[PDB]
């Protein structure tokens, strides 16, 4: 800890050892050196000793750390330095870099230090160039002819400069500073390009060539196209630098970016050049790297050298170029072989086992086959490409990532439309190779079944019929021939998967559909792992698409099949787990909602709900006398499962569920009360730990499922009058006081969520109900969540969702709060601003914006006037604080919008009363003048290192731009840059 003492002289030998203990040590000694170096680096005067380290040290890591300390200085305090320190650092860095390039030992073995020095120089150029350094580029080009190490290193400096100016400036500098630097680079690029082009043509140092090509990759992001097309550089890139593997990787990335240049789409000479560099590139690949027939899947899997990165970059080059320019190659007959070879390389690249690479090629195939589906006279070019692609995608079909599956299905569907016959043949052939065993595998049969199911709905109905029948026959034959339950279960699951994917086929063949369903019922008794889950998932899947054929009476039948399903439901589901039974009931609910005869639908609902209703009446009877039964876990599980069944059926039936809800509603809410008592009694007998017990958790599950049922119906109800007149009143009496009067750890956050749904759907109709909801949950929930940002995370999120919807639908409820409670409301909104939690922060900002709009709509009334007097500047300053504290960057856009709304209120004279105290400012002073004075004083105290000119210029632009959000936000972003440094140019705020 001696080096931290700046009283004495810095012990360079001790520094080199502290640095060594950190990088090469371990244990507590490395951890102690870590805290020391961080403190040494953070000392605001350590930059003064940085010239000693860079001159005297023998440890390259110490010189790196010194350049970092310098970098902090150049980045944040460069303008506060006396003008001669600025000259010395600049001279020292320039001189040190010159010396390092002369010592071939240093230039060869200290690349990290030279790169770090080159970046530090670039930081100086951003501050000083070109206004205080106009001959840099001329002197850079002159010194490049002296040494090869200097020419190469100057390419590294130019590369980094291009990156800092064009690639990474938007966030890190003001708009004016960025534009200034872009214009400066643009004015002097002609000299940069000629030096760059001379090196590429004259050879011969490969490291110099690679560094020159790496800088060219950066230039291509922004330079005008004439530099690429009106010189010979494309020929060089597409021929010379493709042969040598040292330059090949970077050249390929350059050509990829060349394929993205903005280029006139009408000049025929340029179209020739765009064709020509592609033809050269593909020729160098065929002759110098690998022929189009090579097995790229195996090459990639071998992972020799840089092969994987090269094949990735080749896929990027081909897909990028062909997506933009393949029309250039499609009409000329002399270009047909070049077009198909390029796509054949893509075909080979698409067989590589690499998920992220496959998605990249798949995105191109999607682009292609969509174009062959819509554009005239094109698909004939690519039929042999498309035929191979069918096999590639069928054989790589993934389980339905679902995102990758949807992309694969979309391409395979396009390819089925393009040639149905070829698609059938490949799939039946693949199936034949499953049957003869050459490609038999659980993974392989599953993958093929997914592919066969994916193209459902693309063939004609009759062609599809014969396809499906062939597949089902072969799959049934494959099952018969296999031995063992393991193998037979795999095929049967795939058989059910395929049929579930073809509802148009099922709907036209009722006898087969019924056989399917009865088979699924058979499988609900199969103990084998996964079969019951497959049987239930297939059952509801088929029901969703074919429900109408279960509700009507089918020819040659005595009753709609739904009546047959309900009749045998106990036998069918007897071996299923509870969650599987609920899926079954949910499926029946789908079917019943197809019946639009009200009387017949309610009767089906009654019959379906017969078993849960009978088990419900018994429990309501026997658990009311006497409430000891609810201590029995078995009774709690039966109640939870009854309610969950009701949720499942209500989920699919929605508005139609109301008759069944009425059958249980009043006894359910009584049960809710009785369960609430036992939770409360249990917390009294055993303490807060009781809430963790299985007994209480089972009881709270009953309450949670009851709320979820009520929530599910109300969110889907169509008769809102019955909701208000029949449902809302008993619901509030059952849940509100129980929530308010429980200890925090016993309050169910689901109560808030349920209330959110109620207010969302019928809030405009129950103003007194909304007030009672606020009175019961507002202050007690706020006290739970306003001591930190951690505790009660669910209550935190539901709380602000509830406040948000109350503010949208029943704002009058907040108007009836006592002034002390309305003040807690404002506090709660600002409290939400400060959350890093995205759910809280977004809602809190939205509530603030909707609240200001709610106040604006009131007009010139005493409540609106008092609101602005009491809370306008609180909202302005709380918004500025999260805008500027660097810990709420995710909410910038909505902070900016809320702030623009607050500022525009004043510059539109929408605030009637004066915002100030009548003594603190002369009478008749406009709110605008007072607003600019308040903000100036606020920012001056919050950011004391800013000049008054900065603050005034920023605020002048900000207020003048409060009708132009894109510009307003740019000005905020400029302010956020200037507060991170000293000496920001106040004229930057005149950018727009």
């Amino acid at each position: 800890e001696g080096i931290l003492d700046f009283s004495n002289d810095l012990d360079i030998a001790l520094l080199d050892q502290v640095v060594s203990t950190f990088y090469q040590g371990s244990g507590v000694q490395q951890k102690q050196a870590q805290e020391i170096l961080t403190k040494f680096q953070d000392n605001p005067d350590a930059w003064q000793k940085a010239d000693q380290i860079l001159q005297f040290s023998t440890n390259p890591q110490s010189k790196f750390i010194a350049l970092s300390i310098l970098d902090k200085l150049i980045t944040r305090k460069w303008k506060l330095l006396p003008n001669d320190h600025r000259i010395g650092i600049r001279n020292f860095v320039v001189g040190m870099i010159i010396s390092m390039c002369q010592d071939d030992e240093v230039f060869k073995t200290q690349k990290n230090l030279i790169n770090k020095s080159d970046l530090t120089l670039v930081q100086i150029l951003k501050q000083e160039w070109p206004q205080n350094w106009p001959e840099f580029i001329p002197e850079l080009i002159g010194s490049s002819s002296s040494s090869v190490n200097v020419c190469e290193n100057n390419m590294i400096v130019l590369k980094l400069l291009s990156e800092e100016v064009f690639d990474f400036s938007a966030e890190q500098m003001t708009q004016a500073k960025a534009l200034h630097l872009k214009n400066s680079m643009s004015k002097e690029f002609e000299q940069i390009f000629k030096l760059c082009f001379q090196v590429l043509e004259q050879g011969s140092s490969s490291s110099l060539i690679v560094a020159t090509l790496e800088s060219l990759l950066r230039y291509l992001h922004w330079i005008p196209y004439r530099y690429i097309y009106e010189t010979n550089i494309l020929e060089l890139l597409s021929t010379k630098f493709m042969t040598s593997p040292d330059t090949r990787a970077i050249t390929l990335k350059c050509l990829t970016e060349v394929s993205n240049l903005k280029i006139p789409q009408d000049n025929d000479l340029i179209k020739r050049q765009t064709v020509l560099f592609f033809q050269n590139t593909l020729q160098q690949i065929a002759t110098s790297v690998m022929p189009v027939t090579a097995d790229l899947k195996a090459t990639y899997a071998n992972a020799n050298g840089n092969d994987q990165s090269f094949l990735q970059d080749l896929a990027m080059f081909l897909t990028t170029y062909l997506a933009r320019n393949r029309a250039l190659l499609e009409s000329d007959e002399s270009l047909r072989e070049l077009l198909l070879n390029a796509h054949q390389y893509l075909i080979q690249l698409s067989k590589i086992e690499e998920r992220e690479l496959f998605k990249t090629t798949l995105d191109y195939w999607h682009n292609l086959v969509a174009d062959l589906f819509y554009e005239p006279l094109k698909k004939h070019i690519y039929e042999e490409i498309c035929s191979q692609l069918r096999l590639v995608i069928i054989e790589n079909m993934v389980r339905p990532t679902i995102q990758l599956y949807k992309s694969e299905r979309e391409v395979l569907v396009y390819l089925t439309h393009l040639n149905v016959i070829d698609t059938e043949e490949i799939m039946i052939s693949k199936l034949a190779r499953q049957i003869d065993g050459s490609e038999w595998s659980w993974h392989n049969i599953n993958t093929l079944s997914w592919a066969i199911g994916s193209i459902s709905g693309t063939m004609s109905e009759d062609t599809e019929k014969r396809f499906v029948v062939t597949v089902i026959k072969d799959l049934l034959g494959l099952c018969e021939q296999k031995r063992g339950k393991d193998n037979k279960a795999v095929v049967a699951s795939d058989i059910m998967y395929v049929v579930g994917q073809y509802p148009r086929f099922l709907k036209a063949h009722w006898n087969f559909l019924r056989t399917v369903i009865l088979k699924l019922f058979e499988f609900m008794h199969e103990t084998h792992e996964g079969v019951q889950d497959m049987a239930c998932d297939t059952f509801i899947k088929i029901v969703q698409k074919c429900k109408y054929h279960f509700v009507i009476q089918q020819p040659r039948e005595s009753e709609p099949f739904i009546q047959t399903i309900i009749r045998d439901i106990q036998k069918t589901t007897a071996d299923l787990q509870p969650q599987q039974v609920h899926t079954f009931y949910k499926a029946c609910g789908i079917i019943i909602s197809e019946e639009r005869s009200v009387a017949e639908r309610n009767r089906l609902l009654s019959d379906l709900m017969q078993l849960p209703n009978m088990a419900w009446d018994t429990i309501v009877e026997q658990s009311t006398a006497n409430p000891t039964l609810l201590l029995d876990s078995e009774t709690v599980k039966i109640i939870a499962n009854i309610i969950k069944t009701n949720v499942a059926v209500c989920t699919s039936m929605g508005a139609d569920f109301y008759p069944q809800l009425g059958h249980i509603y009043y006894n359910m809410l009584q049960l809710y009360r009785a369960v609430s008592s036992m939770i409360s009694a249990q917390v009294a007998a055993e303490g807060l730990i009781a809430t963790k017990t299985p007994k209480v958790r089972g009881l709270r599950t009953i309450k949670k499922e009851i709320l979820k049922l009520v929530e599910t119906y109300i969110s889907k109800a169509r008769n809102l009058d019955d909701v208000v007149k029949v449902l809302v009143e008993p619901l509030l009496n059952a849940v509100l006081e129980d929530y308010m009067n429980n200890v925090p750890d016993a309050r169910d956050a689901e109560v808030l969520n349920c209330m959110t749904t109620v207010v969302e759907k019928v809030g405009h109709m129950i103003p007194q109900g909304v007030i009672l909801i606020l009175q019961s949950v507002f202050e007690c929930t706020l006290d739970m969540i306003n001591k930190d940002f951690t505790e009660y995370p669910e209550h935190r999120v539901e709380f602000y969702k509830l406040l948000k919807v109350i503010n949208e639908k029943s704002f009058a409820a907040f108007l009836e709060l006592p002034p002390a409670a309305f003040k807690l409301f404002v506090d709660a909104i600002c409290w939400a601003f400060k959350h890093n939690n995205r759910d809280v922060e977004v809602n809190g900002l939205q509530i603030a914006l909707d609240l200001v709009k709610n106040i604006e709509r009131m007009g010139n009334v005493p409540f609106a006037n008092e609101f602005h007097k009491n809370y306008f500047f609180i909202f302005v300053s709380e918004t500025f604080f999260v805008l500027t504290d660097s810990d709420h960057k995710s909410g910038f856009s909505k902070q900016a919008l809320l702030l623009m709304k607050l500022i525009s209120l004043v510059y539109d004279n929408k605030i009637s009363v004066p915002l100030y105290q009548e003594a603190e400012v002369p009478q008749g002073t406009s709110n605008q003048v007072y607003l600019s004075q308040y903000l100036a004083n606020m920012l001056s105290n919050a950011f004391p290192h800013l000049t008054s000119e900065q603050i005034a210029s920023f605020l002048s632009a900000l207020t003048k731009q409060c009708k132009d959000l894109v510009v307003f936000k740019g000005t905020l972003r400029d302010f956020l840059v200037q507060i991170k440094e000293v000496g920001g140019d106040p004229t930057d705020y005149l950018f727009a």
Binding site: I472, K473, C479, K488, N511, F512, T515, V516, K519, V531
Partner: peptide, 16 residues
């Protein structure tokens, strides 16, 4: 109709 196809499916027994 597909009565024979339905008969095969109905027969299906993963335990045989």
């Amino acid at each position: 109709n597909l009565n024979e196809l339905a008969l095969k499916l109905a027969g299906l027994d993963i335990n045989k």
